[PDB]
From TrEMBL:
<feature type="domain" description="Alpha/beta hydrolase fold-3">
    <location>
        <begin position="82"/>
        <end position="288"/>
    </location>
</feature>
<dbReference type="InterPro" id="IPR013094">
    <property type="entry name" value="AB_hydrolase_3"/>
</dbReference>
<keyword id="KW-0378">Hydrolase</keyword>
<protein>
    <submittedName>
        <fullName>Carboxylesterase (EstA)</fullName>
    </submittedName>
</protein>
<dbReference type="Pfam" id="PF07859">
    <property type="entry name" value="Abhydrolase_3"/>
</dbReference>
<dbReference type="GO" id="GO:0016787">
    <property type="term" value="F:hydrolase activity"/>
</dbReference>
<dbReference type="InterPro" id="IPR029058">
    <property type="entry name" value="AB_hydrolase_fold"/>
</dbReference>
<dbReference type="InterPro" id="IPR050300">
    <property type="entry name" value="GDXG_lipolytic_enzyme"/>
</dbReference>
Length: 311
């Protein structure tokens, strides 16, 4: 139990969550990563069977940091695109662990999704991932014809650390005077590594998926220096927000990062950026990947897909 009115699916998933490998059960992030990604990826292999996509292509592109692999899920050519950045605290997860999710988005929308295989920490410290995501996004904008995507409909989005990366990318594009991003989709993002919030304290302990201990561990792996936490490409909540793309922010009710995400949405509104802040009740951080058994996740996904389909 956490606060009380939690979707009954979580109580049914008690064994599952408790059986997952914990970060502090290994001596290094690498070993932890290998153990947890193995589980996530196998599950995705099962789910993808039910998310058919006309074509899924793995391409290697040139980022300032070197090679960057991206996976292009294209259900239909000459369609809108969502450049996506997977979650995982900047340390774990991969294209394969969010494969089912991206397939479903591309399939439902009859469009395109480009999932970025960005450099992970601690191997590559902040801001390596931010630059990989920005480089891949710009590459999508610059290769519109080759990829067969609509250059006038390019969206960016991600979940958790991925939502943070989508926000950072949007800022980096704005700072560079680039205007190709038409929408940013932040799924329960982390946008602050310096200040506390009531939700951070309230759910700092006691919930599955995320607690204060692993959050501190993630930032320790991500940043090479403490003060990097205040960088505007990290704690995006302190960046200049003028002219940023219109945003759809999806938050989870039982999540330490909840208030942060909502405050970031209110700050964007003040700065004159249009934004929607949607809090899903009864769910925890990371809920979107559980769409096969959680309706709230299927509806959250429908919101992302609707953006690529509707005008």
């Amino acid at each position: 139990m956490l606060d009380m009115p939690i979707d009954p699916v979580y109580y049914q998933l008690a064994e599952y969550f408790d059986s997952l490998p914990k970060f502090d059960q290994f001596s290094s992030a690498r070993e932890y990563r290998e153990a947890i990604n193995r589980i996530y990826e196998e599950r995705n292999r099962q789910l993808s069977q039910h998310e058919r996509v006309e074509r899924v292509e793995d391409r290697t592109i040139k980022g300032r940091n070197g090679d960057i692999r991206v996976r292009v899920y294209q259900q239909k050519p000459d369609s809108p695109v969502l450049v996506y950045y997977h979650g995982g605290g900047f340390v774990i997860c991969s294209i394969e662990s969010h494969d089912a999710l991206c397939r479903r988005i591309a399939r439902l929308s009859n469009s395109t999704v480009v999932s970025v295989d960005y450099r992970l920490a601690p191997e590559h410290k902040f801001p390596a991932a931010v630059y990989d995501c920005y480089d891949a996004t710009k590459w999508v904008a610059e290769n519109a014809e080759e990829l067969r995507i609509d250059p006038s409909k390019i969206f960016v989005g991600g979940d958790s650390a991925g939502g943070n990366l989508a926000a950072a990318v949007s800022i980096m594009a704005r700072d560079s005077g680039e205007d190709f991003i038409k929408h940013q989709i932040l799924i329960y993002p982390v946008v602050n590594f310096v200040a506390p919030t009531p939700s951070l304290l309230e759910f700092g302990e006691g919930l599955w998926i995320l607690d204060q201990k692993i959050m501190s561990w993630f930032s320790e792996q991500y940043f090479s220096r403490e003060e990097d936490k205040f960088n505007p490409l990290a704690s995006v909540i302190f960046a200049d927000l003028e002219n940023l793309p219109p945003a759809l922010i999806i938050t989870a009710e039982y999540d330490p990062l909840r208030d942060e995400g909502e405050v970031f949405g209110q700050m964007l509104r003040r700065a004159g950026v249009e934004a929607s802040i949607v809090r899903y009740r009864g769910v925890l951080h990371g809920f979107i990947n559980y769409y096969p058994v959680l309706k709230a996740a299927r509806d959250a996904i429908n919101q992302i897909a609707a953006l690529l389909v509707f005008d």
